[PDB]
UniProtKB/Swiss-Prot annotation, chains A, B:
Glycosylated residue positions: 206
Topological category with respect to the lipid bilayer: Single-pass type I membrane protein
Keywords on record: Cell membrane, Cell projection, Disulfide bond, Glycoprotein, Lyase, Membrane, Metal-binding, Nucleus, Phosphoprotein, Signal, Transmembrane, Transmembrane helix, Zinc
Protein family: Belongs to the alpha-carbonic anhydrase family.
Designated gene of the protein: CA9
GO annotation, cellular component aspect: basolateral plasma membrane; membrane; microvillus membrane; nucleolus; plasma membrane
Residues holding substrate: 192-193
Species name: Homo sapiens (Human)
All ranges on the Extracellular side of the membrane: 1-251
Region Catalytic: start-end pairs: 1-251
Class of enzymatic activity (EC top level): lyase
Primary residence: nucleus
Record's protein name: Carbonic anhydrase 9
Length: 251, 251
């Protein structure tokens, strides 16, 4: 499979034709306020520098694989282990977030993928309700170089080639996310890539993370994808809510 | 295992000492209203008179086995199939509901147990989030004979004996449940019996169903269990919420 052409994803995986797909356009006017939605809890995200992590250009994204012991809770009894994070982005003067807010697409988006602690493996959790949980944050232009992002973006040159990987020191993974863990939208959707299995709990932060213009250009301009194509515009079109209600942790 | 004797539930299953157990005390004033909680959808519950259904005194409760094709949804893409229903009850001058409301114990309680259609087997669903869902309704004393409950209360004589079972005509399972499918409480907890597996979605109707004082005396006074004992007060003690917030489908 690939972005911007064949094969049609439903041919790869029927779930890509499901009624309840991700990503979605967030219209906060139609969001349901749910005061049961408490601030997210992250444990073990502050890593020591050794052992190193693997950062990989997989031709669809840049993925950092996370070590065991990163625990995330969406709430009491809603417990997850972090697997990996990856990015979705655009191209020179084109935004590439997956989620939109009232039709606004942001420059880029981070996804931190988690596995429910009731499941040993992702293949066992695919299509099960709440089996997988993704923390999603928009990346926007700010005036300062983001030093946590710089540790990954400074290494993209080494992994320019599709299927390339490199080792990076452990860092504070939580410094790649917004500091406000209180304000977020939450809905049930799918993987945004094949096999597009449903049952995924999506948390999209209200607060955005700030990268420099130069950092956003490094992300969109450095990596190569399938064939001789630049790895750019690696986002799925917005999918209808089809009667799902996005909840918000704030009125 | 048995009610209020030995062995020690945590020795039978140590999951009975878990942090997110059922039943709980419902405090409606502290429930979080979410407009995402839509009316319960129960299709195929109006069963024909044939085939008959198994009703069994298992020493813990009276259990009615349910046929295939009883479909239930808690929300978009969150579908279930009904497996069985059973009851919890008290004794002479003593209520026996499992759930309480503001510390009040109701005379009795009906549970309709369901399996997520994302799991082929109950043993895969046990201990997985949303694997099992129970619909729960309080039984209260009203002045009239309840027609729906008569079909079961009038067959308890034939199964007074621990481990006894009879066959009963098909009945409208949906007629056992309260009036308003839009008004309920919901939280995530456990089996209230060993093995006390967590990940159960509990849906507790706001409205009660009414039985005659006769009907209630019958339920609590006709069955025998643990050896030479009357089957009575077959409810579990109140479990702490441990930070869980009960949701409400109405403001
Ligand atoms: N965008 S997402 O909904 O958060 C998402 C993306 C990926 C994923 O890594 N896709 C490939 C490109 C990114 O590295 C995976 S897991 C995986 C699935 C198929 C193939 C390989 C891995 C899980 C999720 Cl929930
Ligand atoms: N009270 S309850 O949490 O609703 C409950 C009770 C029982 C149970 O039948 N034992 C108690 C008395 C029965 O007549 C089961 S049985 C079962 C079904 C599928 C999987 C595992 C167990 C499941 C549940 Cl959710
Ligand atoms: Zn993604
Ligand atoms: Zn029960």
């Amino acid at each position: 499979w690939r972005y911007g052409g064949d094969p049609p994803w439903p041919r790869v995986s029927p779930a890509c034709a499901g009624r309840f797909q991700s990503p979605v356009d967030i219209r906060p006017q139609l969001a349901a306020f749910s005061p049961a939605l408490r601030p997210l809890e992250l444990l073990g995200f502050q890593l020591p520098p050794l052992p190193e992590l693997r950062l990989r250009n997989n031709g669809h994204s840049v993925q950092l694989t996370l070590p065991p012991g990163l625990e995330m809770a969406l709430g009491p009894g809603r417990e997850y282990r972090a697997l990996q994070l990856h990015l979705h982005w655009g191209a020179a003067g084109r935004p590439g977030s997956e989620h939109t807010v009232e039709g606004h697409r942001f420059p880029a988006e981070i996804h931190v993928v988690h596995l429910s602690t009731a499941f040993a493996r992702v293949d066992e959790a695919l299509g099960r309700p709440g089996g997988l949980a993704v923390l999603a944050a928009f990346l926007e232009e700010g005036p300062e170089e983001n030093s946590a992002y710089e540790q990954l973006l400074s290494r993209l040159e080494e992994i320019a080639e599709e299927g390339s990987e490199t080792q990076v020191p452990g860092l504070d993974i939580s410094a790649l996310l917004p500091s406000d863990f209180s304000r977020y939208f939450q809905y049930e959707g799918s993987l945004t890539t094949p096999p597009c299995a449903q049952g995924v709990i999506w948390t999209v932060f209200n607060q955005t993370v700030m990268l420099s213009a130069k950092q956003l250009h490094t992300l969109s301009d450095t990596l190569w994808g399938p064939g001789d194509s630049r790895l750019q515009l690696n986002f799925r079109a917005t999918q209808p809510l089809n009667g799902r209600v996005i909840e918000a942790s704030f009125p």
